Amino acid sequence: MGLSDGEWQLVLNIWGKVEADVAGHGQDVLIRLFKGHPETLEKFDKFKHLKTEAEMKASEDLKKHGNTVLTALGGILKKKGHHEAELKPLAQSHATKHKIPIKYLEFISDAIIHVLHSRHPGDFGADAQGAMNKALELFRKDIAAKYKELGFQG
Ligand code: HEM
């Protein structure tokens, strides 16, 4: 499931563009997720009134959470697969506290890739698309393994 040095470079190069506006990207990611898959929004009680993209875009609380999400994922990707320590706390909370079905991680992955297409069409070429998909697939695999280790079957 691993990535070559080349594939990681493609990943970290496009990620570098995300780093110019982590909160903006994070915001757009959660908007895509919540609009494409409303069942995910149901996990955030404090966002229940947010129904339209405009309402979501206007929420600084949602933007702040977007920042929190991509900051954590950024820490993980920069480790190039060597992300045990970063994944431990995240699997623990998401498996045992928030109880986020593993499927929803695939949805947020899709949403991340969508935002990258939206914001960086010049720089997010097909090689970088393939590599990002691989990187997110590794992330999902490793966390899904932790979920089961923790007894979370959702
Ligand atoms: C790339 C995947 C994800 C990353 C990196 C991520 C990261 C985080 C982080 C860092 C936090 C705060 C610390 C913590 O509680 O662990 C958090 C909280 C949370 N996450 Fe995630 N998350 C991801 C996916 C998801 C998805 C897909 C959902 C729901 C469909 C979700 C639901 C939540 C909820 C409900 C909280 C608590 C929010 C609050 O009460 O303020 N997460 N996430």
Author numbering: 0 to 153
Show me the paper's own sentences about this structure.
Hemoglobin (Hb) and myoglobin (Mb) are the key molecules in animal aerobic exercise, as they are responsible for molecular oxygen (O2) transport in the bloodstream and its storage in the skeletal muscle, respectively. In the present study, we investigated the molecular evolution of whale Mb by experimentally resurrecting ancient proteins. The analyses of their chemical properties and structures demonstrated how Mb molecules evolved to adapt ancient whales to deep-sea environments. The atomic structures of the synthesized aMbWp, aMbWb’, aMbWb, and swMb were determined by X-ray crystallography to 2.4, 1.6, 1.4, and 0.8 Å resolutions, respectively.
The aMbWb and aMbWb’ proteins are the common ancestors of the toothed (Odontoceti) and baleen (Mysticeti) whales, which would be closely related to the early whale Basilosaurus27. Two residues, G1V and G15A, are different between aMbWb (polyphyly ancestor) and aMbWb’ (monophyly ancestor). In aMbWb’, these residues are identical to those of aMbWp. From aMbWp to aMbWb’, V13I filled a cavity in the hydrophobic core, T34K added a hydrogen bond, and K118R (interacting with another substitution, E27D) introduced an electrostatic interaction on the molecular surface. Although the side chains of G1V and G15A from aMbWb’ to aMbWb did not appear to be interacting with other residues, their introduction might increase the rigidity of the main chain conformation. The consistent results between experimental and theoretical evaluations indicated that the observed solubility should be an intrinsic property of the Mb molecules determined by their structures. ΔGsolv increased during the evolution from aMbWp to aMbWb, whereas it minimally changed during the evolution from aMbWb to swMb, indicating that the single-molecule solubility in an aqueous solution rather decreased during the evolution. However, the resistance to the precipitant (β) significantly increased during the evolution from aMbWp to aMbWb’, slightly increased from aMbWb’ to aMbWb, and remained almost unchanged from aMbWb to swMb. The analyses also revealed that the adaptation via the ZMb-increase strategy reached a plateau at the last common ancestor of whales (aMbWb’ or aMbWb).
